[PDB]
């Protein structure tokens, strides 16, 4: 299983983002992310053996009970790579809470994997709270920045499986976790 932890989004957030995606329909080189897949990843795990499921599940429940629901703000768009042909178009979101959950999980995964966690794809990348809007499958141009200024309540996150299939990746939520922490 190819697994990752992520935050799914509420209606007003998906709609603001779906209106954003709009600037990109004239460009067939842009592949827009289906609204119900729009999400912010806190930690990608790559291919993991089934034997580890319980540990990722327990890790989720642990972190969930230690951290409280927090407010996030959607704020501006960007591309990767920053210069040259872009690979991705994403929205920047921000909040201490995303960083705290990302740290909490990298920590748990290290305890469980030790040295092996380094081999996880993109493990060394510094966490950037980003929400992908579209991916560049063919030539397409950058579009001007999209400012959002939209605050919303983050109440939990999930452990999700991704499977590459025809039309693209199909997501299955193995579990949702509710932020219930006192902190």
How many angstroms separate the Cα of 54 from the Cα of each of 109, 111, 173, 175? 12, 14, 14, 11
Any catalytic annotation for residue 61?
no
- Residue pair 1/53 in contact (Cβ under 8 Å)? The answer is yes
Q: Which of 36, 39, 61, 183 is catalytic?
A: 39
Q: What are phi and psi of 165, to 5 degrees?
A: -130, -175
> Could you tell me the domains of the chain?
1-183 (3.90.1140.10)
- Residue pair 40/57 in contact (Cβ under 8 Å)? The answer is no
Q: What are phi and psi of 7, to 5 degrees?
A: -110, 125
Task: Tell me the C-alpha distance between 84 and 128, whole Å.
Answer: 20
Q: What are phi and psi of 111, to 5 degrees?
A: -50, -45
Resolution of the experimental structure, in angstroms: 2.5
Task: Tell me the C-alpha distance between 107 and 11, whole Å.
Answer: 31
Any catalytic annotation for residue 36?
no
């Amino acid at each position: 299983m190819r697994l990752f932890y992520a935050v799914f989004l509420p209606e007003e957030v998906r709609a603001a983002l779906v209106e954003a995606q709009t600037k990109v329909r004239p460009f067939r080189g842009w592949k827009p992310v289906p609204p119900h897949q729009l999400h912010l990843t806190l930690l990608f795990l790559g291919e993991r053996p089934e034997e580890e499921l319980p540990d990722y599940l327990a890790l989720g429940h642990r972190l969930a009970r230690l951290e409280a629901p927090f407010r996030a703000r959607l704020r501006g768009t960007g591309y990767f790579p920053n210069e040259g042909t872009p690979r991705v178009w994403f929205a920047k979101a921000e909040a201490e809470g995303f960083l705290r959950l990302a740290e909490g999980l990298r920590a748990g995964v290290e305890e469980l994997l030790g040295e092996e966690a380094v081999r996880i794809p993109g493990w060394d990348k510094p966490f950037k709270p980003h929400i992908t809007l579209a991916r560049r499958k063919a030539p397409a141009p950058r579009v001007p920045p999209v400012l959002f200024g939209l605050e919303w309540p983050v109440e939990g996150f999930a452990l999700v499986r991704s499977e590459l299939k025809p039309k693209g990746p199909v997501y299955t939520v193995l579990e949702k976790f509710s932020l219930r922490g006192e902190h």
